[PDB]
């Protein structure tokens, strides 16, 4: 549902010449208590990685 | 170079801190301190 909360994390920082950071989204909690582990890549608005 | 030699041999002298007596400090308690074996409470009778 909309308003479900997704929790992620990043690490390692950027190298030189890099302008995007890898984010992994880990879990999502539905407003009604449903919980699913989706260890999926986080992308930009058009699907570009990180 | 003699000057570079002297610098190389005396450049790493760690600093010294001086704190005067009577100054205020804190102690941030790092663990739970349990005082249950050395004190007990009792009510003082009225008058």
């Amino acid at each position: 549902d909309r308003g479900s909360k997704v929790v992620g994390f990043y690490q390692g920082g950027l190298r030189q010449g890099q302008a995007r950071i890898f984010v992994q989204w880990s879990r999502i909690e539905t407003p009604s208590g449903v919980v699913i582990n989706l260890d999926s890549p986080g992308t930009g608005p058009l699907g570009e990685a990180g | 170079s003699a000057a570079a030699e002297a610098l190389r041999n005396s450049i790493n002298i760690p600093p010294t801190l001086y704190k005067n007596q009577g100054e205020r400090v804190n102690i941030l308690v790092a663990r739970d301190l349990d005082f249950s074996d050395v004190y007990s409470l009792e009510s003082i009778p009225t008058k």
Partner: peptide, 26 residues
Amino acid sequence: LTAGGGGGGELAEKLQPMRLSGSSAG
């Protein structure tokens, strides 16, 4: 005479708890 998953390697290493054991007064 005598007888005889484990990943998140850096963030999860930074989140390891520090558990200091309490003290009892004497």
